[PDB]
DNA sequence: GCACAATTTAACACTTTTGTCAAG
DNA sequence: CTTGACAAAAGTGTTAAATTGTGCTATACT
């Protein structure tokens, strides 16, 4: 300040003072420490599978069996992403695929009462938080509320994916019945694989006593 | 029972990938590495050692 | 019209999923409590997934196969078979990118092996708990310079981007033996019972007398 | 044939189940000593011997 | 057992009504409740094994 | 665990002394008026300069790069404003820093009373929003109470805040809650009815009747209205509800499909579409056409007499008679062959 | 009518299985005799 | 009885609770108009 | 919980199209 | 096969009624 007179000789955050007429500088380094899925996305998006490959090659021929082993079991996944031709940043999703309505049906039965899949309520309680958040990131709200609200997003999203691999599974209020997510349909005895693919009810059949 | 057992031992662990693009300890099938070494012998390159 | 002998599997990317979706489900509603029709943006909305009735647009101006596929200029619904609602997906655009719990909590944990992190640390990291270094910008922590991939906490993070400051309590009636905006040393007294724990510039807070 | 607004909603006894009728119990709502579910006018109950 | 554990859920519905409103004019006629008990019994007599 | 998490994060900051509070509101409003005085300088909008302050305070390019794919141009409508307000005399310059620090303090106020908001939403459990989700919607109802506060009124911010916390919470529970969507007033009116029910069931000791419960409700209320809205009250049923005494059974699979044709129905509609074709062949060439033009068998759409007459060149009267003799002519063949006497449901 | 039963195509449980996987951001592609795209949903999800 | 902690004022006023199903002659209740039965349970006795 | 602007709906006055009848 | 005359049905326009979407209050309460 002072039209080119006083000048700080050290790094740090600058602080304006109207009362004491001073531009004070507080020692600090501008660092980008970002915490969250965003940062992880940054790293994954900047990764060089090729570099890490040729590096882990030299790393693997290390005489010690341990290091060699970890290097193997690493370059494994790396090579997977190589031969496949897929980018790891996709593992961090920006757009959540919504399943079609007839796949997640809601229909009324006799008596008039309705019915619905658990994945519907999941796919709903997701959008709620992802929305409120979008309003906050607009209207200028404090980092605490943001970091927490955004946390419930990363957990809700995952709840629509694998419900229960983290914490007590979300259930309809009042009931202890876990919500069935995408992964809940596939895996399992009665899942869409074992009950609706490798076996099924049929047509033109029947049974009786012998 | 024999069929089952055959399926039980059909995977071998790699030792010294040699001239192949394989990696030490990269476990794969029997017939696979077999055919690999088969071609490698013809191409003049050194085969791959492995443990059942 | 062509033989099917092979089935691949890959990782879907956000830009791909955007291609899949016929629309972004905004309003987290199911249907109207009266008309029982899909809400404007509701997860069952015909305007994107498809008609509830064969070859009928919502408003009902195009009611027949005579007009096929032509999008309605009133309701916005494509006149076609009502079966399309089983294969036409949606998507939800996340304000903040999030990861897929699969790769996160999976036994080998792909994203964990790639980034060269641990399931324990990458846990807090992705879940918004502890910060992670990206381009330290010539920073330092406890004498040992912090580098990328390292994991910080709230305190040390702010301490490196906002500097370090120490609050000293004053019992009513007591005065500061040090002048406002004056440089103090560690151990030096600011008040009869106040002992400075850092070299730097102290500042008055809410004076009780002038 | 006149297309009447109203269609047949009736209740026909399932296959394999046949016999006589020894009971008639019909309880319409708004009747004394009978509370019916909201949105339900009447209910009919038949017994088959 | 279900009656008492269901009654404690009423006891809490008691301790939240008295701590507000008008602490002067109150009777248990406004401080009790049915459902915390009623539903507690209705639950047992049906769903339990 | 996110639960203890939020609590500890808000437990990382002290609350506020009465002094700190009054001062907070003071500087905050000084910044809010500072921006207002800036609008009278460079001639910009009230909210323009306002948000642009957050553009240098609330963060770098992270604030305008994700309020959705569209908010307002960062390098264009902002950067020009970040330099347009940059060349001003010492008179106007200070009013900028007062906006930065003034708007800054707002955040401090919110963070401070956050330990209140969380303790407010605490007695609201059961709505169908688990704590954090419930608390969050309440926290935003703090952000409203803040910018609208007045220190001059010599009122502790608690009283003003709390009401705006309960407002937001009671607004979210009527806008989310139940799986299906319920317009706000109606959601409330439900609550009013149940509120009466559990009341006179308490006084009389026996549960009420649809007539008396409506009686104690007010004018216009009858025995039907209460049961009427009561039908709409109850929410859907989880398709995952296990039926029977077993663990291998569900409630979903027990639901048929009417939205798709059955094989017998396809074969049925096929038999009608065929038998009608051959039964059509036995008619006059003009009436055979005119017939399927009036039933919409051609283009799927029905053509009124006015159109048919313009198709052949006859009048709207001739076509009319043509149909009369047509149907009645197939009548004779049908009263015999009895092939199409079916399809009578 | 007597004709021999035609040759079926999509089990339809599988189509749903595939879309369910698509919800997991899993790209499931069906191929033919030479590494080539095969549309199992006739004109449906094509967009 | 609802009694004040300070005022020393007593207020009794009997109230209502709900409906408790009664057992029949044979030993089986009737829930939702259906004849059900409560089967005995068994578990280890309390103690050391 | 309420005053009320916002928007939807049923309300209804009335114009025009379309099925229709006795007579050429 | 054809006019002219009509009533019922289907339009077309402006309203009154209702239904639904919103901002908000101030002792203090963290
Ligand atoms: Zn339309």
Description of the structure:
This is part of a larger assembly, with three copies of chain A, four copies of chain D and one copy of chain F (345 residues). With 210 residues, chain A is mainly α. In chain A, 41% of the residues lie in helices and 8% in strands. Chain A has a two-stranded antiparallel sheet. Chain D is flat and about 40 Å long. Chain D is an all-beta fold and 49 residues long. By secondary structure, chain F is an all-alpha fold. Chain F folds into three domains: 1-178, Four Helix Bundle (Hemerythrin (Met), subunit A) (Up-down Bundle); 182-235, Arc Repressor Mutant, subunit A (Orthogonal Bundle), CATH 1.10.10.10; 261-341, Winged helix-like DNA-binding domain superfamily/Winged helix DNA-binding domain (Arc Repressor Mutant, subunit A, Orthogonal Bundle). Chain F is 62% helix and 0% strand. Chain F is built from 14 helices and no strands. Chain F is elongated. Chain F starts with a helix and ends in an 8-residue tail after the last helix. Chains in contact: A-B, A-C, A-F, A-G, C-F, C-G, D-F, E-F, E-H, F-H. Strand 3 of chain A pairs antiparallel with strand 2 of chain C. The structure holds zinc ion (ZN). Zinc ion is lined by residues 57-59, 61-62, 72, 74-75, 77 of chain C. Chain F binds a DNA duplex (24 and 30 nucleotides) through residues 10, 15-16, 112-120, 144, 148-150, 153, 155-164, 167, 170-171, 183-186, 188, 192, 304-306, 314-318, 320-321. Chain D: Belongs to the RNA polymerase beta chain family.
Q: In percent, how helical is the residue content of chain F? A: 55-70%
SSE succession of chain F: HHHHHHHHHHHHHH
Largest sheet of chain A: 2 strands, antiparallel
Strand order of the largest sheet of chain A: 1-2
Proportion of residues in β-strands of chain F: under 5%
Oligomer: part of a larger assembly
How many domain regions of chain F?
A: 3
SS field, number of helical segments of chain F: 14
Which pair of chains has the greatest number of interface residues, and how are they split between the two chains?
A: A-C, 79 and 75 residues
Write the CATH architecture name of the largest domain in chain F: Up-down Bundle
Outline of chain A, from the CA principal axes?
flat
Q: Structural class, judged by helices and strands of chain A?
A: mainly alpha
Biggest pleated sheet of chain F: none
Number of helices of chain A: 6
How large, in whole angstroms, is the Cα Rg of chain A?
27 Å
PDB class: transcription
Keywords: protein-DNA complex, Bacterial transcription initiation complex, transcription
Entry title: Crystal structure of T. aquaticus transcription initiation complex with CarD containing upstream fork promoter.
Chains A, B, C: DNA-directed RNA polymerase subunit beta'
